[PDB]
Amino acid sequence: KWWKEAVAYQIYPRSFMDSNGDGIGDIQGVISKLDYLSDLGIDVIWICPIYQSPNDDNGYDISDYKDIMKDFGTMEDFDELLDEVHHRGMKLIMDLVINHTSDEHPWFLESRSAKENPYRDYYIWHEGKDGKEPNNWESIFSGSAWEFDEKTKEYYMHVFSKKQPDLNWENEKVRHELYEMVNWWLDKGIDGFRVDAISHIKKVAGFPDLPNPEKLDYVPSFEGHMNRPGIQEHLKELKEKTFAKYDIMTVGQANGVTSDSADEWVAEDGGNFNMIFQFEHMGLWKPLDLIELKTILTNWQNGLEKINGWNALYLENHDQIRSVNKFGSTAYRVESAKCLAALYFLMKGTPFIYQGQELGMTNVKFDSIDDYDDVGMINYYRIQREKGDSHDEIMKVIWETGRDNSRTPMQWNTEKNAGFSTGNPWMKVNPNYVDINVEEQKSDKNSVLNFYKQLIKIRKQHDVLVYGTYKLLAEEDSAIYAYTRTLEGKTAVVICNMSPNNQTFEFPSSFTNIEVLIHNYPLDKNETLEQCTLHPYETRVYLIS
Ligand SMILES: OC[C@H]1O[C@H](O[C@H]2[C@H](O)[C@@H](O)[C@@H](O)O[C@@H]2CO)[C@H](O)[C@@H](O)[C@@H]1O
Numbered sequence: 001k002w003w004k005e006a007v008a009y010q011i012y013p014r015s016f017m018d019s020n021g022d023g024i025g026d027i028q029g030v031i032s033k034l035d036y037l038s039d040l041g042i043d044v045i046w047i048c049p050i051y052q053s054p055n056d057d058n059g060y061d062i063s064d065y066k067d068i069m070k071d072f073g074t075m076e077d078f079d080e081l082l083d084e085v086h087h088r089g090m091k092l093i094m095d096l097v098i099n100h101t102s103d104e105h106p107w108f109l110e111s112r113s114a115k116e117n118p119y120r121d122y123y124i125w126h127e128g129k130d131g132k133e134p135n136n137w138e139s140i141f142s143g144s145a146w147e148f149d150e151k152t153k154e155y156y157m158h159v160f161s162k163k164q165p166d167l168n169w170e171n172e173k174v175r176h177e178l179y180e181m182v183n184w185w186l187d188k189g190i191d192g193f194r195v196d197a198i199s200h201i202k203k204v205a206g207f208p209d210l211p212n213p214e215k216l217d218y219v220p221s222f223e224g225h226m227n228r229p230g231i232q233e234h235l236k237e238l239k240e241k242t243f244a245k246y247d248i249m250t251v252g253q254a255n256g257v258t259s260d261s262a263d264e265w266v267a268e269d270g271g272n273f274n275m276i277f278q279f280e281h282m283g284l285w286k287p288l289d290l291i292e293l294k295t296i297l298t299n300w301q302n303g304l305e306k307i308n309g310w311n312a313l314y315l316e317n318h319d320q321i322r323s324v325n326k327f328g329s330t331a332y333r334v335e336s337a338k339c340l341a342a343l344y345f346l347m348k349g350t351p352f353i354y355q356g357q358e359l360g361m362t363n364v365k366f367d368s369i370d371d372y373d374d375v376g377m378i379n380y381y382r383i384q385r386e387k388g389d390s391h392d393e394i395m396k397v398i399w400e401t402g403r404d405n406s407r408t409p410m411q412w413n414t415e416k417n418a419g420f421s422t423g424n425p426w427m428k429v430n431p432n433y434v435d436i437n438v439e440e441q442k443s444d445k446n447s448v449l450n451f452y453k454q455l456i457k458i459r460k461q462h463d464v465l466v467y468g469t470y471k472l473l474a475e476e477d478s479a480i481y482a483y484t485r486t487l488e489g490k491t492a493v494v495i496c497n498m499s500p501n502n503q504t505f506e507f508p509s510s511f512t513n514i515e516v517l518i519h520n521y522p523l524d525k526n527e528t529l530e531q532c533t534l535h536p537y538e539t540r541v542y543l544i545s
Pocket residue numbers: 057060061097140160196197198253254255318319376
């Protein structure tokens with residue numbers, strides 16, 4: 001229940017704060033900015049992976065689960081971080097990455113060393129078919145999901161990068177070692193986990209070929225490994241052997257789960273996580289189809305209410321483009337950032353803020369493929385270039401859909417590199433840091449940052465915004481997203497003009513008192529309550545007694 005009332009902040013440590021001038025974020029960097037997060041009102045910090053890693057996938061390829069990434073510091077730095085976080089009245093959850101390891105993990109080095117060895121079946125090996133790969137599956141990062149090993153003359157599976165071989169969850173020995181490792185971390189007093197790629201751990205037995213109607217070189221392979229029947233057996237054991245033994249929060253990153261199939265994932269009774277990151281609102285690729293967004297988020301509000309589940313609320317993370325671009329408007333950057341904030345943050349659930357979201361940071365446009373880092377898009381670039389796509393065509397996809405958009409340095413001030421580093425950043429800063437930065441926003445009472453500060457405050461001060469029942473209003477309005485939160489004798493009315501235009505809206509009325517809790521435009525003297533005249537991306541929250 002503390003996790004129900006919490007607001008969480010997600011840190012991408014490579015790009016949060018560089019404390020020693022090599023252009024790479026680090027743990028002492030995070031420590032140096034804990035004042036910022038405490039003052040924001042954050043309750044829980046989720047930090048992306050900080051473990052030993054070759055960084056083929058920036059931390060999500062782990063070669064030692066019990067050692068800190070050299071770039072980021074030492075275990076002593078981590079211990080200091082956890083101690084400082086805890087003394088500041090915050091909690092910290094770690095990123096648990098156990099679908100796959102680095103190919104430089106000692107388990108895999110042994111596993112690949114000989115066709116027969118005690119670690120061979122820790123991973124997923126198969127001989128080829130017809131002088132090619134074992135099947136036609138595509139990696140999520142493009143190319144084959146199988147990599148040939150010359151020494152042992154077999155392929156190993158990698159859903160993600162070539163340097164991320166999948167662990168074999170059908171091997172009890174593997175599961176036992178993972179559970180020991182998880183509990184080792186929990187014994188240090190961390191407060192839980194965000195659980196990476198967790199819907200991918202069950203593969204269809206025998207890894208059969210997928211249908212290939214369009215005759216591709218490789219077939220997108222989600223139907224072979226995403227949320228496959230049999231997965232719940234593993235996740236139930238994971239919970240029983242680890243999570244259930246501690247008072248922690250868990251949020252599972254669970255692609256392929258829908259609002260009607262979330263029962264075994266988050267139900268109060270028997271659910272394997274406290275909440276999940278669901279993907280249904282993150283694949284709406286013009287004018288945003290607002291009513292489709294209403295349908296999806298409302299499905300999840302109503303769906304989880306029915307099974308006493310709990311939503312994880314979010315619009316941004318290290319895998320997505322920036323939300324002003326995705327859901328708002330660059331023509332109304334500040335206003336749409338605040339509108340989006342009220343919209344997602346005040347539904348029923350635990351809200352997550354991704355670093356820079358609270359500033360209204362936006363997408364970046366680098367001209368050179370050398371300026372990007374994301375293994376996914378770098379692969380995409382090579383493959384599509386060879387197939388004949390022009391540089392421009394490809395960069396368009398990268399600019400408009402690439403997750404590197406969310407990985408540019410956190411924008412602290414207007415000094416060199418926006419104060420992220422004294423050195424040359426591993427990823428270039430967005431040039432708009434001259435306009436968009438923490439220092440500027442602290443002093444402006446109408447900044448995006450101070451709007452988030454207010455959202456956190458009113459959610460904390462009014463129980464109806466935590467435990468109140470959600471109901472969608474004005475479903476057919478293609479511009480206005482409005483909804484209520486109701487708890488006993490209190491009703492909050494959240495009104496969001498999700499359009500770049502002025503709009504009229506009838507107040508969806510029976511109250512003894514009304515109060516405006518938050519608003520991103522100045523209130524108009526002569527405006528009547530009943531006839532809202534809302535400015536582009538205007539949001540208001542009313543509290544009704
Ligand atoms: O650790 C690999 C990869 O996993 C997570 O994101 C995945 C997600 O789990 C999948 O469902 C899939 O569709 O693609 C995502 C990657 O694009 C991590 O969040 C991600 O950073 C990481 O690379």
